[model samples]
Every structure is written in C-alpha cells, then in structure tokens.
Target: QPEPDMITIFIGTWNMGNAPPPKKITSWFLSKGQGKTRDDSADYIPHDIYVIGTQEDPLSEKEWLEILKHSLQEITSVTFKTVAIHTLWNIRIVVLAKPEHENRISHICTDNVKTGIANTLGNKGAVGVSFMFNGTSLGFVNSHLTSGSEKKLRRNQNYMNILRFLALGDKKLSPFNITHRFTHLFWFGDLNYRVDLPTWEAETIIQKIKQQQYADLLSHDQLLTERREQKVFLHFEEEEITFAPTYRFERLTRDKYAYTKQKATGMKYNLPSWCDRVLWKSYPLVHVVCQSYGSTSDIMTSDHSPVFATFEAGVTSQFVSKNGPGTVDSQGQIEFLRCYATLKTKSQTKFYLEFHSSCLESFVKSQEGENEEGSEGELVVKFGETLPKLKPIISDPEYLLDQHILISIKSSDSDESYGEGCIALRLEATETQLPIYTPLTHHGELTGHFQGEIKLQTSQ
Candidate 1:
C-alpha cells in the first residue's frame, strides 16, 4: 500500500528595488529563533520545495535566473534542484524541488495578467504557474499591485482582474476556476496594501513592532478591512503577523524606516506597512498547516524586507521506482526474457518489439547520432504517425493491461553501417507531454555474426 505524506513548502517574496542581492541568502531564508539572531547549531532541515517571488527586480531575466540558481544551490541541501524560473518585467518567480519528487510534477501551466497601463503592461500584475504534485494539483501566483494608499481600490480591481485573467493549460475556458482550481493555491508578493491610519498614528504604532504589538495596527489594515467588510480573498488564509513591517526600510541602515526620515524632516511620510506577504488556500481533502510566517530583515538590498512562510501540505503518495523496474538495456547484445515464449533467430532475421502495455499513451523513439538534433544520421519514429497498427495484448481489467505498441526491425541491418544501432524510447501523457515511462535501449546488433538461431523470450 502507498503511504500519504506531508511535504513542507516554503515561499518568499520581496521587492528588490533593482539592488544587487547579498552574497548570502541562507541566513535570511531559513527559519531561525524568535528574536533577531540565528541559532547555527539547529538542525538544518530544508523544505521540499522553495518558491521565490520578486518585484522591481532590475537584473535581466537570464542574469537573475543564474543568480537565483546559484544562490538556491548554495543554500539548499544536495537533494534539491532548481526546476523552473520565470520573469515578467519587474516581477519574477523561481521554483526548486527535490529530485525524488521530480516525476510527480506534471501538466505544468503558466499565465500572466498585466494590470498596469490599462491592464496591458507587465509593470504591475500577477504571474503564476500550476502543476500536479504527486496526486494533488497546486497553483502558485506571484503578484505586484498598484502602489499607494489611495490606489487601494485599484489594487482590489487588480486582484479581481488577476483572478479572472490567469489560467492553466490551453483551453479557452479553464476547466477549473483560478481561485478553486488546484488542491492548494499559494498567492504571494508585494501587494502594496497599507495601514488605515493617519501618518503620525501609524508611525506611533510601528514603533511598537519590536514589542510584538503590530497586531494592534492590523485592525486598521486596509487588506483586513477589505476582506472583512468586502468579499476580497474570500477563502484564502494568512497567519497572524508577529514580525515587524516589511516595507519602506532604509537601504543602507536596513533596520530604520526611510519614511521615518521624512517624518523627522517634517515632510510627508507614508507609514511602514507589511506589504510583502504569503497566503494560501487548500481543497477539503488537503490540509495546509502553517509552520512559520515572518519577514527576513537581514536582506537589505530592497526597501521592502523579504517575507517568507513555511507550510506542510498533505499529499497522497504512490510507489516511485528509483530505477525503472522490470526493464533491461540490451546495449551490446540481445538478451532473453525468462518469463515467456522463446523464439530462435539468427542474423538477417526479422523480429517485432511488442509493447504490451504502458502508463502513457504516446511514446517517442530515436536512434543515436552525432549532431545535437541528430540530423546527421538518426532514425525517428513517432507513435500513431509512423508506426504499425497496435492491439492490446490483454483486455481483462484484472490483468491491468490494455494499451499496447509494436515496432518491427531486422537484425541484419548492417552492423558497421548501423554500427551498434540502438533505439531509445520514452513515454509521455497524450496531451500534456509529461514523462510517464522510459524503456531501456534495445540494440540491433547480433552476437557472433550469424550464429544461426538463438532463443529470445517475450516479456510477460
């Protein structure tokens, strides 16, 4: 029986202000003690997946991607690998996951809705991707809304537009509502919401942030008000804020608020706010337990401090073979299978490869070649388009074998000319093209020139 498991997911968001990233991000990315300092001796258990979102990121997409890859590799355990990176104008998102669970991710879909400049430009908007994780589907959106207290209405509009516009896959109408699509949905970024208070009063409340009294000001937070009175973010949930405000910090000093400087000069000042945030919603079958939520003050490149959240999402697990089981590679010579009828054949004999059943509907076939595209010399066989008619070997549900594939080949097809000629095959889902199975290469070379006939057994 397969076991169910809980996978910890970590998400982080920041408005980088186009500044160079610090040399070390691990110090800030990982969870630490409640206070300002970190406990180095603590066991370094890393999350299964890390999703990072950024805004106002000045670096070129490629440049930032390389930087992010290197930084993630530096911080993550050897088991983790950076899988995908996406950027739209000032906003970016990166996904990292463990190798063991790589195959469980499939049907990847991404879309963006620009709410800036008449809802066409990417300056302010949301970009997202959704994929099936193990047996559950998950979606993550990273957004940046119109900034300022007066634009709260515009921000709400942005939210609605983003939800209405974003989609997964290529259907004209998404099969599932963006808000209700996946088993779990993660929404995060620099949302730009502010406290509902006068500048003086807001500043006074921010002074008590270190004392864990920021919750006092949360009563007047525009987002909380909109969610309570209005119907925004209907089902999403956010952890209680205990961390200091995450925006408008001095770049150099890092800790002190730059807005406070304006206040000191008797000039206008917008109070510091918890603009960077992480929130999520889950389907009834899944449980999303928040472990920790707060801002990482150590990263000072951006005026807004980066915020992070850790969650444990329940997932249905299934057996995943480390190495493809019941498969063997006949690289140099043909091998006999012990479980079925045997056939004797010699060089210049004809043989048929029968794929009794496969988890995938489509499978690819290719032969070795020198060039990258294998254009110099290669044999390509696309299923359905260039293969003989296939019939199921077993139709009984109890036997669990239905779909099948068959290919014919000759053994005497020029050894030196076809020189160790072997065909590699891989299977993928019909439409999504997600990998499902890979078969071992079968070589066409026969041993001992033409040794009359030999026994060859078919797989059960």
Candidate 2:
C-alpha cells in the first residue's frame, strides 16, 4: 500500500560538527526558523537527520539524548533520534523522524555501521536510515564521498560498498526481504563528484542499480570548452534548460577591510555547485519530478544550502499494491485514451491541427505545446520529435476540405512520462463541428515538470 500521490522525503547532508553542540543546536534553530524558514511546519515537519554518527569526543549517550529531547520539545509534534556508531567522536546516521513516522524510527540504525567507514568505525562514508512508507519499506543512504585528488577511486569504492549494503544489509535489517519488499532505495548527500567531470562516477553506481529499474533524477551534461570549440550545440536540435549556479559558498572574509572595492563573484556569497543530489527507485513505477529545488539560507549555519524534490508516488499505479487500486484492476491500466476519450471527441479537426502545431512549436519554441490547435468534430493529437516538432499526429476524422486529419493515436508502448516533464500526446478525443482547441496535455502545455539536457563547463 504505497500512497503515491506525492511523498516528499526531504534529505539533506549537513556537516554539523565544525561547531560545538550548542552551535549545532543554534544552527538548526536558525536554519529552521530564520534562515531556512519552513512554511508548512505542520504538514512538512522539518524532519532533520544526520549521517554524522557518534562523536569521538566524550559526548555521552545520555548527553546526546538530552540534546535530542530538547530539540523535539520545540516542535512538540516532531520526533528525532540520533543513531550513534558508539565511536569516540562524530555521530553518523541521525534519524529525525516526523511525528507521523515516529514508530518507523525504530527501524532506523541508532549506531554507526560497526565495521568502519563503509563498515562502522569510519566517518560520513556509509550511514543511513530505513523506514516504511505506506507498506513498502524504503531505505535512504546519506554519504559524503572522498573529496579532492582521491575523489575518483574512493567514490567508486564508496558507492560499491553502498550498493553492497543496499543489496545485502538493508534486507537483513528490515521486516521484508531487501531484494523483494525493498521498495525504494535512495543514495544521496554531498556526492562530491561534479557532473561535467571526465568520469561518470555517480552514473556508474546508478547503472548498476538501474538494473532494478531505479532512476537517477538527473540526466547531467557538461558543456566542455573543447566541445564549445567544436560547436557541439549544433548536434542536438532540442533546446536545453540552463541552470543558474547551483551552490553557494559561505566564506569568512578575514580581511574584509583590506578588500574594500574588490569585485566578488556571487559564487562567494550565492549559488555555487551542483554537487549535492538525489537518486531514487521505487517498487511501482512513478513519475519523478526534479529541479534545482534550492536550499535554505547559507547566512547562518554552514556554507552549503539544502536541495529539495518531490515524487508523485503512484501515478503509474505500480505500487498502489501488488494487488490493484479498487477501481483500476491489475491488467486494466488507467489508459489515458480510455480515461480522456470523451474529451478528445469534443474537438475534431482543431485537435489534429493543434497536434501538428505542437510538434513544430516545441522544436522552434523550445517550450512545447504552447500552441495546442483543435477543431470541432475531430479528435487529433500532435507530437513532435522533440517538443513542438510534431513528429506525428492523431485524429478521429477524415481529411477536412483542405485540413489534414489525424484519425487516432494507437500504441501499446508505455506512456513513459507521468505528470509534467516531456511532451506527451492526449490519448483520446472525438470529432464534431464544434469550436475545439488544444486541451492541456503532458509537457505539451505549461506545468512544472519539463525535462531536457543542458551542458555546463568546468573551470580548469
């Protein structure tokens, strides 16, 4: 029983150790109240968790518990637990369970992985939480891959260990089998590798897990200067969405007075890198919508900001249950054609024209389906190779006097897109001599979910 409308698993990898416990406490207070300012504290109860396990310092078990209780009291409804690795310093895997998810906290690990870094004894390399959403259990691994010169090899090994855990460890800890009942498994945090780098560090790990059909929310590309010189943009006709800088650095300007008129790139104070990211896979198929869902303020606690995303849980009806929704049967899919057939019939000729128009519009406009054309007494759908390219058209009527008519759209191919992102044609429509126009479709119309590729270059 997965409630798939939309479940927001707000994950953030925070380095809360540079400061004292009091500073960490104050940092959270400021991040939640002033700096981050979460609007729906009731619905979205700032559930904070830490991959930082037990500190080497003499912060006793009792002391940490007191700190947690103190924080929990602030928002009475919220709940939290710190899973300590029982090491001398640094606590990894902190489970800040939402009040609604209090009982599930028990499923989370309270101690560090006993082996060491990837095992138990090491730092932020391996530590995470496992909990049940609806009935399907999901696990989240929050990690900080090795930085600098050693990033390549270490990241691979680190993720190998992560995959090993997802493959083996997660099952042993959960109520159901890991390979079986393990619905959604996520790997996130400040995954140190940059997208434009020479290696596909994260993608390597992703491909291994994608055999399970899990999807990485990002399809990243780097706009290399070499490619720029070669003029690679000419290769693809699809327009890509550009990202304004993705991260911000919090710097302590020791010599502020000495640099009175120095020009500061916003990188020093605002957007920085696209290092932190999320990748997830769920049991039932779903429509995953992602963005540069930016972070909380960097003015207060740490240098980095939080990135957010939302998952439309059961759009594909893959996870509602192995059984089926009451209305939609196992073999019976909620076909967009069958669901929206009556609506399609309303517009005959105009719909086909709109369909053709949508394809042409998507390619040239970059924004697809801004122009949805339709005519009364005809059902037509237009789709472009890219957006607005109108690669094909579907209609329910014969060719009009001068009007080219698309009779119908037929395909057993899955509607790969769910909610917003890409251009998807309407599944059904009818024809009549009515004044018809293009109705809202998938990425064809205006909604938030738009997906395309963009390339970014790294400074040498």
Candidate 3:
C-alpha cells in the first residue's frame, strides 16, 4: 500500500487594476510568519507550493520575473522554482514548487480561453495550468470575467466558457470537463461579479461594510446569490469568508472602498464587491484544509486587494477504496459522515427501542426497536453547527489524518444504562480498508460487535 502524505499550498489571487508589482510582498506570503515561518508556523510542513494568480497585470511582458522568485527564495529552505509561468495578456499565473518537490511534479500543461468578446479578446478570459504532483493531478484556473453588472448572467457563461474550452491534455484522457480530471481544482482571479445593488445605493452599502456587517452585506452579493441559485460554481467550496470585499478600494488607502470617487476620466460611483476570490473543488474522500483566508491589506498598489488562502492538501494520499486512489480535497472540513454498525444488549430477550451516538456531525441511531440486533443508522452532517472552540481544530491537518468515529449504543429508555456498549474509537478498516467488523466494548468488556466507515466529502 502506498503511504499517504500531506502538503501545504498557498493560493493568492489579485486584480491588479493595471498596477505593477510592489517592492515587497513579504506580507502576502508569510501569513502570521511575517519574516520566517508563521508564528505557529509549519516548520515540519516541508513543502510549500504557491500558486499566485492575477488579473489586469501590467507585467504581461517578461519585464523581469525576479521579484516573485526572490520573495519566495528568502523563505524557502532550498529554492522555490517556477513550475509554470503562463500568461494570457493582462491575465497571468505562476505556480511555484520547492526544489525538494521538483522531481515529483510532472506533465506540466498550460492553456487559456480568450473571452473578452466571445473568445477573441485577452482583456477578459481564463488561463489554466495543470500538472501531476506526486502522482496526483492538480489544476488551477485564473479568470477575469465580464464586468458589466447588468451582464451578470454573462459572468456565468464566462465561467463555463473556461471549463468547456481549456483542454489540458489529450481529449481521450480528459473527456468532458477539464476541471473534474484533476484530483483538486482551484479557480481564482478577478471573477468581476458585483453586488446586485445599483451604483446609486453605494453609500448605504459602504456604510454597512464599514461597520463590518458582512452577513447582511453578503446577502446582496452577486456571486453568492448565483452560487446559491445553482447558476455557477456547482459544488465548489469557499471558506466562511471573514474578510471584507477585495474590490473597488480607492488606491493607497486601507479602509476606503471606491463607493464614490473622482478619476481623471470623470466622477463615478462603483459598488464595492468581492470581485477577487479563491475557490476550489476536490474529488470525494480526499483531505484538504483551509487554514487561513483573507486579503493582504499591507499592499494597496491596486484598487483591488489581494486575497489569499492557505491549505493542507493531500497529494497522492493512500486512496485505495471503492472510489480509487491519489487525490487532494478542496476545503478542510469533514463534509460528509457515514458509517454502519450493529449492537446487542447485555440483558437478553428483547433489549430496547434504539441506540444513538454523536461523533462526526449528528446523532446516529439504530434502525429499529425491541430486537436483539441493532442494524443501520442514519447520520447527517450539518455546516455552521459546530462549537466556536472547534474552529481552530478544523484547520489542523493532523485532525483529519488517521481519523476515527467511535460509536456508542445507548438504550432508548433513559434508565437502561448497563445494556449500553462502547466503541474504542479504533478504525479496523482505517483509510485504505473498509467495511470490516470490529469489537464494541463497554466499561472494559467486549459486549457487542461493530463495523463502520468514515468518508470525507469535498462537495459544498
């Protein structure tokens, strides 16, 4: 069996608004670890793969690629080499990997779709790059969609345009959608979707944003509404989004959004929105975690702030089950929780009504009542229904690795306690193996038998 491993990846997307690279992007790179590794840094996480995507980049030409390389070299243990540097006019993307991982990454392919005017213009389009890392396929897309607010429906078309057109490898290898071919896919850039509100109501939205009313502010967000309406990003996963919108900021200011501004052309109103974003989708049962998601406020060279997200992606994990092998999950939470088990009570001759346990997401109960055997139980996973303390634990990579779901069979009657059985939280099947019978004990005695499985889900 191939051993499973995990790696950290940093994905940052920015709409340059035609601005050049700044003198220093240290803050953009090192999250909490400003100079060295993060404060609670992952010195143990030997690999740091960065995929930086941008829109409206003035550095279309190879004026000099030294800055981006230099910034990472200072932080890397060996050296960070460019895996792919693909640009489509103003849109550009750079994928970097450590020298330690150079040999492991292979079959680098790059493609782009020109969507400025029906796949003819570079001003608006998508650039996609995919490669095999440690035997697992990964893909990244940087897109700048149409900007007209009234043409909001067009944005969805622009998104689908990239997926349908950007063919990474041979058509036979990747038949239909190029996105699903990869184990994990990240779609990031200036998507250009705005708030559903008009420019006249900008001041009111600005006031709400200033007060950090992101909950209500996002209610009118065009992208979320579209995704909620199932018009775009069918099953992609994005973090809770604790940061403010990354667009329409007046250049050279921290707290100012371009609600009302005077430019050389004329005075105009712009609705501030989260035009720039980083979202991903992973194959089922793969593990990926988003440790951080926010915008870099230190650099304001452009009207749009740079948004970044750090992840612990499972590249070439030991995935040898009914679903197949080798994949990386998009987001870090346990999406789905499923398992099956049977129970028997100490007191024979008609035990109890039911047995239930709470571990992964919700309470799971026995199939039927007043029987010697406890059959299947149904469990439902609910999002945003967790303890606040578990927020940090969700981001820890170790939590997802070598995971186990211990089950308990409690008597439906509030009184019958001794008939209950306990599971030692052991995974007989673990990750690679599945659907095996194990022992279920209670108070140090093997009372009954159990069988279960834990499946990680990437769908949002």
Candidate 4:
C-alpha cells in the first residue's frame, strides 16, 4: 500500500529594512518555547522544513544563515542543514530540512531573476529554491517587488517578468518544469503591495484593529486586488490574516504605527499595511494544509514585522527496490498525467505555448510544412491534414503530475499576449474520449482552438 505522511513546513518572511539583526529571533519562530520534535499537544507541530524569504535582509547571506542556524536551535532539538539557497543581493530564498531528512532531499537547485531597475538590478528581485523532500517536491520563492503604492503595475509586471525568466536548476536537471515541478509552491517576501485606501481612511480603519476587523482593510489590499484582476499571482493562495499588517511599524513598539520622514512627493505617514506576506498554491490535485498564518510582532528589530505560515504538507510513499528505496530521484510512476494537444492559431507563425510546468522541451509545433494559405487565412491543424498520424510528445516521464495543465499562447512576434486555457489531464489509465476541445482567447472575437486529449497510464 502506498502511504502518505504529513510534515510541518514553515514559511517566514521579513523585510529587515536594513535593521540590525536581533540577538535572537526564536520568538519570531516558536514563541521561544512552543516547538517540539514530537508534541502531541496539537498546538506544537515539528517544523521539519523551514523556508525563509527575506527582503532588504540586513546581513549577508552567510551572516543571515548563521542567525537561522543558531536561533532556531534555541527551541527545537532537531537541527537543520541548508539544502538549497540563492540570493539576489538582499532578496533571497533559503530552504532548510531536518538533518534526518537531509539525505532524502534531492534535485536541490537555486535560481534568481532580477526585476529591479532597468530589469538588471538585484536590489529588487526574486530568488527561488526547489528540491524533493521524501516523496514530495517543493518550491520556495522570495521576492522584493517594487515599492510605492502607485507602482502596482510595476509589481504585477515584475512577477510576470520573473515567471518568464526565473529559470530553476541548470541544464542537468532543467526541464519545462519550474513551479509545475513542485507539489506545493511557497511565494513569500516583501511584496510591497499596499492598502488601497488612502492614509486617513486606512488609519481610520485601523482604529477597529482591536475589534479584529481585518476584513474591512483587506478588501482594499493591493495584492488581492491585483490577483482578482489576474494581473499577477494568478491562482496562488494565502492564508487568512488574523494578525494586523506586518509593515511600517515603529521598531520596538508593538502597537504603534511608524511615522515617516516626509520627503518631497511623499507623506510623513508611512501608512501601515501588510507589505510582507506568504502565499502558496498546491498543484492541481495535491493538497497542502495551512495550519496557521499570522505575523509575529514581538520581534521589533525591523520596521516591518515578520510574517509566517505553518503548513501540514503531505508526502507520498515509495516502492523500495528491496536493495534500497531506489534513489531520491526515483519516480512514482503510478502517480501521473500524460497530456497532448494540437493547437490552432490564426496564422502559420511560430506560437509559444507556455505550459503550467516545464520549459526544456515544449509542445509548440511549427506548421511550415502544412501551412495552406486559405482565403480566410486562419491557422488550423485539421485531422484531415495529419491522417491519424500523431507524434509521441515526451518529457519528464519520471515525475508526478498535475491534473490540469495551464497553457498560455503568444505569437512569436513579441505580441502582447494571444490567449490562455487549461487542459484537465487526470489519472485516466484507460484513456478518455478523443479531442476534448478548448478555446484560448485574448478578446471576445479573437481565439484559438486546442484538442488536448492524450494518453494516461502507469507503465513506469
């Protein structure tokens, strides 16, 4: 029987604002006494996995890591080793796993994308790290987006830019899989998205914080607003914000919002907002339970309070080879999804089909050999054109897959965007009806057609 076990995953993010590192940050992690290796108290779950993303990190990567290494040891008996790490200046993502599971972690890789000034600055960008844990794959991304309430467009575009260029792990382990390679993706850092309400209106709303009226203020959060607009973080998820905003706090003052020094073009009131955050998304069919999401205000070393989320992440079982558990790279072939698609756009030009995962080898077909210039000038891969001849498209057959694969279409001319759609390629070992058709549209009358009914089985 294939077994499933749960592990605790912790995500912590903070924008230190170049503040000096505190002597101890254990309180920011476990209340200084709440964590344990085996606490059945229900309140304590072993933080076997720790993924930290920080922005404006005051210390160098080495210095910051030492804090993590020694600070967490203050509470838990289990020490961890850094499995993956990448730092783009102060924007960095680090993944640490318990020492016992260190050997179990494999395919560890780090990647970074610079979305800061002129698309070349490391000061504002994202760094990502991914690795396989037990039988599960995970991705941790930390980004410091552009600041300023009005720069929302920059922030949204920064994310899209990151997605386009954030290549993970070098060629040896590279494929079309980026986020798709992971069962769960944790994206957290100083997103810098602010409250939509004006300072006075926002301040007025803050009066009710003691009343726990997070909803009123959340309605105006720039991040959620952008998500609704499908501008960035398209389908990602973040836990409820039961705590107050994590940004613009007066250091060492738990309840006081920090006042800023006004420069020309800025106000003295910094406007307390949830500038730092943690968000995640489970792959199409996987489930990750978020145990808690809140901010730690007791650590007042930074202008922004630290934010974190605790999750119960599940790992699948493996088929031991008797001689061994095979290797960390061993695939659970029984768990899979095989997808195929025949795309039809409006022209013979090369079109890019961005998959929900993977990039090494993609499925964008060139129609040079079969482009019949019709009077309507529409592009089509009609069944009659191929006569039942289908090519075997293959890549990464050794990994668990998502049920629905999201694909976006764009013309080769660097056009804005063509369209997007998703194909549900579930665990259908017996195969499904042919050609479940779907449409990709940029606007009402402009569209493309796709037939993505492909094979699904467990031969590995």
Residue runs of model 3 more than 4 Å from their true location after superposition: 1-4, 32-47, 60-64, 116-120, 261-268, 317-460
TM-score of candidate 1 against the unseen true structure: 0.64
lDDT score for candidate 1 against the true structure: 0.58
lDDT (10s digit) by residue, model 3, range 1-460: 3444777888878887788867877667665311112444653343468888988888743552577777776655446778898888888888888876777788899999987464536478888888877646788999998875667788888887787788774343322265445667889888988877767777888788777787877888888998888688866798876777778888888778866646742464467788888889775557788877777778888998888778888765322322212222334333212333344443433222122211133333333233323334322111121211111122223344433332344444542422222222223332233343444443323345544433332222
Mind giving the per-residue lDDT tens digits that candidate 4 earns over 1-460?
3243778888888898778767867656662221122223643344888888888876877888888887766666557798877778877777877787866778887888888565546478888887776566678888898887778898887777666677663343222334344667788889989887776565576686656677878888899888877677765788666677777776777777764546732664556678888888665556687776777656888888877777888665433332222232222211112222344455555454454423113233322222344456666433223222122122222333333444555556663345555454444443333344445544322256555454433224
> Where in model 4 is the C-alpha error above 4 Å?
1-5, 31-44, 118-122, 169-177, 259-261, 264-269, 317-455
Comparing candidate 1 with candidate 2, which one achieves the higher TM-score? 1
Local accuracy of candidate 1 as per-residue lDDT tens digits, 189-279: 9998887777667557657775667767788778888877644665578888777778788785565776653544346465778788887
lDDT score for candidate 2 against the true structure: 0.33
List RMSD in Å for every model shown: 18.6, 18.1, 14.9, 6.5
Can you give the TM-score per candidate against the true fold? Answer: 0.64, 0.41, 0.66, 0.75
Q: By the TM-score metric, which is better: model 2 or model 3?
A: 3
Clashing pairs in 3: 33-38, 114-119, 289-332
Runs of candidate 2 with Cα error greater than 4 angstroms are 1-7, 21-91, 99-124, 165-181, 195-272, 287-292, 298-460
Supply the global lDDT for candidate 3: 0.62
Q: Model 4: how far is 338 from its true place, Å?
A: 15
List clash counts for every candidate, in order.
0, 71, 3, 5
Model 1 weakest lDDT span, ten residues long? 444-453
Error of 4 at 418 (Å): 7.4
